[PDB]
Structures are given as structure tokens and as C-alpha cells.
């Protein structure tokens, strides 16, 4: 049972701008998704300080980066707080209408796309490199859900009967054909070292057979 929703018009406009602006510095998508994972891990850590049972769904707080050249996917997995169904539908827990407005104005005034995370809508930078994005998420207060979009103005949500996650968020980037450099170990390592060196959780880059 799959539900299809329209993006709010401002979010569709954000996505179109990310997809159709000429902008070479695409590697910042990974910094922005790792930043979102760090923020989600901080949230479950803070809740655990007063209620240790919040970690019954998994004590380890960390980030995995999983390239798969056969499937052409890069997956960013975290064991943070996760999202409810309502959060997914409401722009993946962001204030994206207001953040898009501000970002648009900042671009007009001379900012560039790499500054997206200052506007709270860094998730959508995934569309610099991905033709389709799938988000699998599990919050202590909800069931496991899958959100997916190939842009074009709509997204889907379904209950996920895939491999159970425990708690957290997994962002699966189905890469554009010309963006396969982001599956190469040396390239991923270089980007994590350049932009994510002060993230306070382990970031494990998986190896391929
Ligand atoms: Cl808003
Ligand atoms: Mg912040």
C-alpha cells in the first residue's frame, strides 16, 4: 500500500533549482547528509540522558557509509532518533518552506548552493548526485517507513517490510550515471576528511568485494 503526495510548491522549486543549476561542487551533498545524521544522533543521545530506555532499540551511536557499485547506490546509515511518518511527510523533519525562501533570497544576493545547510534544507542536496532517493527510517514512537522520490513534484511513503533497522535513518542515493565517483573509496575518504572531520560519532566506510 503506497501513498503518493505532492511536494509543497516551494520544495518542488528547491528541488528543480538543485537539479537544473550548473554547479560543479557537488561533493558537499555528503557533508550535508552526515551533518543531518550527526544532528539526529545528538537528539537520541540527549533523550537518553534522562531516559536510558530510549537506547533499548540500539546503544551504539554512529554513521555507516555503504557504497554498492552493482546497484549504483551510496547509502548513509545512522542510528539517530529516526523520523515518524508525520515527520517524513512534513519535509523530513525540516522547516523547508521557510528555509527554501531564505536560501533562494541568499542565492539571488550572491550565496552559492554549498551554503544550503545554513538554511536547514541540506537533505535536498542529495539531488545533486542522485536520480532517486529512498529514505528508510525508524523512530522509537513509530513503525519503519520508506519515503522515496525521483523529484518531478511527488514523493511516496509506505510501511517498510524490508530488513528491520532498530532505530535511525538510512538515506539510499541511487546515483546518476555520471556521478559514480562517489562510490570510489578514495573519493569518499577525501570528502569525509575535507568536510566532516569534526563530527563526533564514528563514520565507517564499508569496503566492497
Ligand atoms: Cl517553514
Ligand atoms: Mg545546527
Swiss-Prot record:
Changing residue 82 to D: Abolishes ATPase activity. It comes from the Eukaryota. The modification N6-acetyllysine is found at residues 43, 69. ISGylated. Residues 1-209 are annotated as: Interaction with NR3C1. ATP binds at residues 36, 78, 97, 123. The TPR repeat-binding motif mediates interaction with TPR repeat-containing proteins like the co-chaperone STUB1. Homodimer. Identified in NR3C1/GCR steroid receptor-chaperone complexes formed at least by NR3C1, HSP90AA1 and a variety of proteins containing TPR repeats such as FKBP4, FKBP5, PPID, PPP5C or STIP1. Forms a complex containing HSP90AA1, TSC1 and TSC2; TSC1 is required to recruit TCS2 to the complex. The closed form interacts (via the middle domain and TPR repeat-binding motif) with co-chaperone TSC1 (via C-terminus). Interacts with TOM34. Interacts with TERT; the interaction, together with PTGES3, is required for correct assembly and stabilization of the TERT holoenzyme complex. This is Heat shock protein HSP 90-alpha. It comes from Homo sapiens (Human). The gene is HSP90AA1. The chain holds residues 16 to 224 of 732 of the full protein.
Amino acid at each position: 500500500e503506497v501513498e503518493t503526495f505532492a511536494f509543497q510548491a516551494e520544495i518542488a522549486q528547491l528541488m528543480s533549482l538543485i537539479i537544473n543549476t550548473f554547479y560543479s561542487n557537488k561533493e558537499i551533498f555528503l557533508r550535508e547528509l552526515i551533518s543531518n545524521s550527526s544532528d539526529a544522533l545528538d537528539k537520541i543521545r540527549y533523550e537518553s540522558l534522562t531516559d536510558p530506555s530510549k537506547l533499548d532499540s540500539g546503544k551504539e551511536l554512529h554513521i555507516n557509509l555503504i557504497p554498492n557499485k552493482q546497484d549504483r547506490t551510496l547509502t548513509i546509515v545512522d542510528t539517530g532518533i529516526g523520523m515518524t511518518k508525520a515527520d517524513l511527510i512534513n519535509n523530513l523533519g525540516t522547516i523547508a518552506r521557510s528555509g527554501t525562501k531564505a536560501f533562494m533570497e541568499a542565492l539571488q544576493a550572491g550565496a552559492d548552493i554549498s551554503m544550503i545547510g545554513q538554511f536547514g534544507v541540506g537533505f535536498y542536496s542529495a539531488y545533486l548526485v542522485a536520480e532517486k532517493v529512498t529514505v528508510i527510517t525508524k523512530h522509537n514512537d513509530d513503525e519503519q517507513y520508506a519515503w522515496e522520490s525521483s523529484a518531478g513534484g511527488s514523493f511516496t511513503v509506505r510501511t517498510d517490510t524490508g530488513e528491520p533497522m532498530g532505530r535511525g535513518t538510512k538515506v539510499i542515493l541511487h546515483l546518476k550515471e555520471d556521478q559514480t565517483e562517489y562510490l570510489e573509496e578514495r573519493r569518499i575518504k577525501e570528502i569525509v576528511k575535507k568536510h566532516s572531520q569534526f563530527i563526533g560519532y564514528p563514520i565507517t566506510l564499508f569496503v566492497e568485494k
